[PDB]
Amino acid sequence: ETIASELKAIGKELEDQKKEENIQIAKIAKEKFDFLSTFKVGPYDLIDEDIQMKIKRTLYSSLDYKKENIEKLKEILEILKKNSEHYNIIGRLIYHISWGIQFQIEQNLELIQNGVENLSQEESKSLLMQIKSNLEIKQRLKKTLNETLKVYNQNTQDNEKILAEHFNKYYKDFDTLKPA
Amino acid sequence: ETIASELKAIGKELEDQKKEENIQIAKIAKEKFDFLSTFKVGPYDLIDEDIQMKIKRTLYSSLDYKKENIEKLKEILEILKKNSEHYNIIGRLIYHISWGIQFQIEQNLELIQNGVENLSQEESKSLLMQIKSNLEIKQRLKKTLNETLKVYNQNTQDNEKILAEHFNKYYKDFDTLKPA
């Protein structure tokens, strides 16, 4: 106390975030653009529903459950998936970060659900700090995926510009063609 | 004579080219990757079978009837089609150049089929020159589409490189994320 009051309030906050994401994720599954349900890094990779749920929670939250952004992320991952050298860095985002955050959050929610009374003044202090660090990461990631989408959108746009300048250079007439 | 011998020979050559392209085009329609059959520049554009045939002859010849290249051209045109500002330059390639070449070739084949005897020494000289100029253009274009495909392949490759360096920069760990 009053860390016990702070913890119960931040626990209720996290449980609300979880309830709204459960609803928002359910609609994406019906609207049939839940790519993470079928997403494999390698080819012969097995998919666990519980692990995927946590990944969906992180990735669809950071993209504000927007179909446009969710599809664009699918496209980005599909591009990198082509080269087996990118398999590790995809896993860093999908597992270590996206699943990792939710895994820590579940553990933190459980300590609150178990009872804040069963925790010492030092344990209570650390739990509040940990929750705040995880919530900060959940935002850090959101701001990173935004930059990722900006990088992908910029490249798409640049490709159109380059193709257009090439077309205007060479296809103006018969005389603008490359020599035989 | 012997321009009459040269013309009858170059006419037979053009008729063989036409016969082999007719076969090669027929197989593309069976293997269901003949995008030009359904290709519109604008949205409400009407498609003429005879005009399209000539476009198919030029474009599928230049790409050596390769499915990979034919699909890549479809992708390039689809990208530029998004902006109405690129509608004119697409038409320069599709109609003025691709249909235009075949239209001139048909006229040249007809003058040979009509009879080289019904042509003066000056008309015979000009027809041979014209045929050679058109055959040179058919090569000029082939060497341009090759560069077009190289530009598109380079852009695709550059996009993979950029996305990879972005991923390794920001998704290495939790600490490599963008701070708030």
Author numbering:
A (entry chain A), B (entry chain B): 70 to 249
What does the study report here?
The differences between the two CspA structures are likely to arise from the different crystal packings. This leaves the structure of the ten C-terminal residues (240–250) unaffected, supporting earlier evidence that these residues are required for the assembly of a stable dimer. Further weight is also added to the hypothesis that the dimeric species is essential for the function of CspA as the ‘lock’ to the second subunit is unaffected.
The crystal structure shows the formation of a homodimeric species mediated by inter­actions between helix F in both subunits.
